[PDB]
Design a protein around this ligand. Structure first.
Ligand SMILES: Nc1cc(F)cc(F)c1
Ligand SMILES: [Cl-]
Ligand SMILES: [Cl-]
Length: 162
């Protein structure tokens, strides 16, 4: 198991513009295109990202390319964040994949409001952090996914991903 396989399992893969769980336009492997409700804005955004007139559809390679750049950007966003970095660098490898996932899903922004959880993870209070993390809109809106990430942080193993 690695980050790519993990997120690939959490985001699935779609080659045609779709709406995500929040109803925003996305494509490929969880690549958000825009939060706007205009399809046309979304297809324009897709063309810009791919570098060609896609007409709302892309190839698998194209999807994988976007995914690589998005994983990259996520980690980089972490290392560049002063509140994040120190927590992330205290964690072991598996749990670091769980931090990337959460960020890939919610943005550095979404995740910066997890202050109390961040602190628990930093102090390596696993069970405590896991209860705290569940107390959030993130776990109530996407429970099955959130359960997997939470277990990942709680145990430091890939058991939830089988
Ligand atoms: N949950 C979490 C998210 C991050 F971006 C970094 C980190 F260390 C923990
Ligand atoms: Cl791009
Ligand atoms: Cl879910």
């Amino acid at each position: 198991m690695n980050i790519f396989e993990m997120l690939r399992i959490d985001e699935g893969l779609r080659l045609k513009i779709y709406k995500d769980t929040e109803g925003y336009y996305t494509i490929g492997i969880g690549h958000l295109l825009t939060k706007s409700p205009s399809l046309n804005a979304a297809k324009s955004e897709l063309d810009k990202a791919i570098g060609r007139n896609c007409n709302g559809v892309i190839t698998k390679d194209e999807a994988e390319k976007l995914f690589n750049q998005d994983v990259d950007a996520a980690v980089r966003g972490i290392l560049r964040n002063a509140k994040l970095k120190p927590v992330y660098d205290s964690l072991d490898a598996v749990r670091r994949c769980a931090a990337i996932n959460q960020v890939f899903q919610m943005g550095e922004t979404g995740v910066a409001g997890f202050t109390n959880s961040l602190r628990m993870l930093q102090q390596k209070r696993w069970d405590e952090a896991a209860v705290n993390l569940a107390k959030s809109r993130w776990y109530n809106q996407t429970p099955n996914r959130a359960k997997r990430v939470i277990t990942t942080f709680r145990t430091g193993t890939w058991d939830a991903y089988k």
